[PDB]
Design a protein around this motif. Structure first.
Motif, PDB file in Angstrom:
ATOM      1  N   UNK A   9       0.841  -1.189   0.000  1.00  7.02           N
ATOM      2  CA  UNK A   9       0.000   0.000   0.000  1.00  7.02           C
ATOM      3  C   UNK A   9       0.878   1.242   0.000  1.00  7.02           C
ATOM      4  N   UNK A  17       5.937   9.939  -2.828  1.00  7.87           N
ATOM      5  CA  UNK A  17       6.104   8.602  -2.253  1.00  7.87           C
ATOM      6  C   UNK A  17       6.775   8.703  -0.888  1.00  7.87           C
ATOM      7  N   UNK A  18       6.020   9.187   0.096  1.00  5.73           N
ATOM      8  CA  UNK A  18       6.544   9.458   1.423  1.00  5.73           C
ATOM      9  C   UNK A  18       6.323   8.317   2.395  1.00  5.73           C
ATOM     10  N   UNK A  19       5.517   7.321   2.033  1.00  2.00           N
ATOM     11  CA  UNK A  19       5.180   6.253   2.959  1.00  2.00           C
ATOM     12  C   UNK A  19       4.712   5.043   2.166  1.00  2.00           C
ATOM     13  N   UNK A  20       4.990   3.856   2.702  1.00  2.00           N
ATOM     14  CA  UNK A  20       4.586   2.600   2.092  1.00  2.00           C
ATOM     15  C   UNK A  20       4.478   1.552   3.190  1.00  2.00           C
ATOM     16  N   UNK A  21       3.516   0.640   3.050  1.00  2.81           N
ATOM     17  CA  UNK A  21       3.280  -0.410   4.029  1.00  2.81           C
ATOM     18  C   UNK A  21       3.104  -1.740   3.314  1.00  2.81           C
ATOM     19  N   UNK A  22       3.874  -2.744   3.724  1.00  2.00           N
ATOM     20  CA  UNK A  22       3.702  -4.112   3.252  1.00  2.00           C
ATOM     21  C   UNK A  22       3.091  -4.931   4.379  1.00  2.00           C
ATOM     22  N   UNK A  23       2.393  -6.007   4.015  1.00  3.31           N
ATOM     23  CA  UNK A  23       1.727  -6.829   5.005  1.00  3.31           C
ATOM     24  C   UNK A  23       1.404  -8.210   4.477  1.00  3.31           C
ATOM     25  N   UNK A  24       0.993  -9.081   5.397  1.00  2.00           N
ATOM     26  CA  UNK A  24       0.660 -10.461   5.072  1.00  2.00           C
ATOM     27  C   UNK A  24      -0.441 -10.933   6.013  1.00  2.00           C
ATOM     28  N   UNK A  25      -1.310 -11.817   5.518  1.00  2.00           N
ATOM     29  CA  UNK A  25      -2.558 -12.162   6.184  1.00  2.00           C
ATOM     30  C   UNK A  25      -2.800 -13.664   6.062  1.00  2.00           C
ATOM     31  N   UNK A  26      -3.485 -14.250   7.050  1.00  2.00           N
ATOM     32  CA  UNK A  26      -3.682 -15.697   7.077  1.00  2.00           C
ATOM     33  C   UNK A  26      -4.907 -16.048   7.917  1.00  2.00           C
ATOM     34  N   UNK A  27      -5.637 -17.086   7.499  1.00  2.00           N
ATOM     35  CA  UNK A  27      -6.737 -17.659   8.279  1.00  2.00           C
ATOM     36  C   UNK A  27      -6.417 -19.136   8.486  1.00  2.00           C
TER      37      UNK A  27
END
Lengths: 52, 140, 52, 52
Positions: A9, A17-27
Motif C-alpha cells: 500500500x 512517495x513518502x510512505x509505504x506499508x507491506x503486510x501479510x494475512x492468514x486464516x
C-alpha cells in the motif's frame, strides 16, 4: 481457510512517495486431536533433564 | 521482584493509518423551563470496544442567584455518576470547563454506550442555557 | 469451524449357545472433534525520511 | 574504509481477530559495520662489503 497472501500500500500520497506499508494475512486453526476427553495419538512423557 | 513486563510483552507498535488515532464525541443539550431533579438526556454515544481518555464539560450559567445551588451528574445507564459527580459548573459564580478525574481508562461494556446528563440538585432560579460534553477515546 | 467424527471398536460378549441375533442389542460408539479457525496477520511500514 | 549492512528478523504479535494491515506498524531493524584499511610493508638491504 486461507493460505498466506501478501500485499502492499502507498499510504500518505501515491504521488509524493513518502510512505509505504507491506503486510501479510492468514486464516488458520490448529488443535490437538481430542475425542471423549482423551488424547487421540500422543503419549506425553516427563523426564528429569538437569541441563548441565 | 516479580513485577514482570506487562500482558503486553512481545509486539511492534502503532503509527500512520486507520487505527485508533484518538477521537471525540460532542453534544450540546439545551436546558429550558424550570430545572428539577427529573432531568435526563443523551449528549453523545460511544462504541463498545473503546477506552475513554478524557471528558470535558463546559456549560453556561444556568442558576443566576446570589447563592447558586445547581449541580450536574454525567454518566451512563449503568452508573449515573461515572464520569462527573457533583460538577457545579453550571452555577453563575464559579467557572466552567472542568476535566474528568474519575473513571478514565476503562473498556466500555454493552449497554453503557450512551452518555447521560442528570441533574442532581434543584436550581434555585432556572435560566436558559446549554451544556457541552466532549469525550475522547480510541479503538483497537 | 470443522467437525470430524470417530467410531470406536466393538465391545460385548459372544452370544453363547442359544441366543438370537435379534434379541440382545449393541450400540456403536461415535464421537466428534471440532477445530475453530481464526484470521491473523502482520505488517511492516517504510517511510521516506529513513530511506534517502 | 568499507561499510557493510545487516538486517535482523521480525519481531511483534500476529494481529489477532479484527486488526488491520494499515493500523498497527513495525520497523525493520538495520545496522552497520565498517572496516578500516591501512598501508604496511617491510624491506631488506644488501651491501657489497658483506657480499664479496
Amino acid at each position: 481457510a486461507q493460505r498466506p497472501q501478501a500485499g502492499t500500500e502507498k499510504s500518505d500520497i501515491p504521488a509524493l512517495n513518502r510512505r509505504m506499508t507491506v503486510g501479510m494475512d492468514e486464516i488458520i486453526g490448529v488443535k490437538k486431536a481430542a475425542f471423549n476427553g482423551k488424547q487421540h495419538g500422543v503419549v506425553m512423557g516427563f523426564f528429569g533433564a538437569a541441563g548441565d | 521482584m516479580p513485577a514482570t513486563n506487562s500482558a503486553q510483552a512481545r509486539l511492534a507498535a502503532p503509527g500512520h493509518g486507520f487505527g485508533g488515532n484518538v477521537k471525540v464525541s460532542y453534544g450540546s443539550v439545551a436546558f429550558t423551563g424550570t430545572i428539577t431533579t427529573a432531568d435526563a438526556a443523551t449528549v453523545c454515544n460511544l462504541p463498545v470496544g473503546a477506552i475513554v481518555l478524557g471528558v470535558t464539560l463546559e456549560s453556561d450559567d444556568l442558576d443566576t442567584n446570589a447563592t447558586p445551588t445547581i449541580t450536574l451528574n454525567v454518566g451512563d445507564a449503568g452508573s449515573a455518576t461515572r464520569y462527573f459527580s457533583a460538577s457545579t459548573v453550571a452555577q453563575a459564580g464559579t467557572s466552567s470547563s472542568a476535566p474528568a478525574t474519575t473513571g478514565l481508562l476503562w473498556t466500555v461494556t454493552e449497554g453503557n454506550t450512551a452518555v447521560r446528563i442528570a441533574v442532581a440538585n434543584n436550581a434555585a432560579t432556572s435560566a436558559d442555557g446549554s451544556v457541552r460534553v466532549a469525550v475522547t477515546y480510541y479503538l483497537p | 469451524t470443522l467437525n470430524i467424527p470417530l467410531f470406536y471398536k466393538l465391545g460385548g460378549a459372544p452370544v453363547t449357545g442359544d441366543t438370537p441375533i435379534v434379541g440382545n442389542e449393541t450400540p456403536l460408539d461415535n464421537y466428534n472433534c471440532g477445530v475453530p479457525v481464526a484470521l491473523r496477520g502482520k505488517g511492516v511500514a517504510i517511510t521516506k525520511n529513513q530511506t534517502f
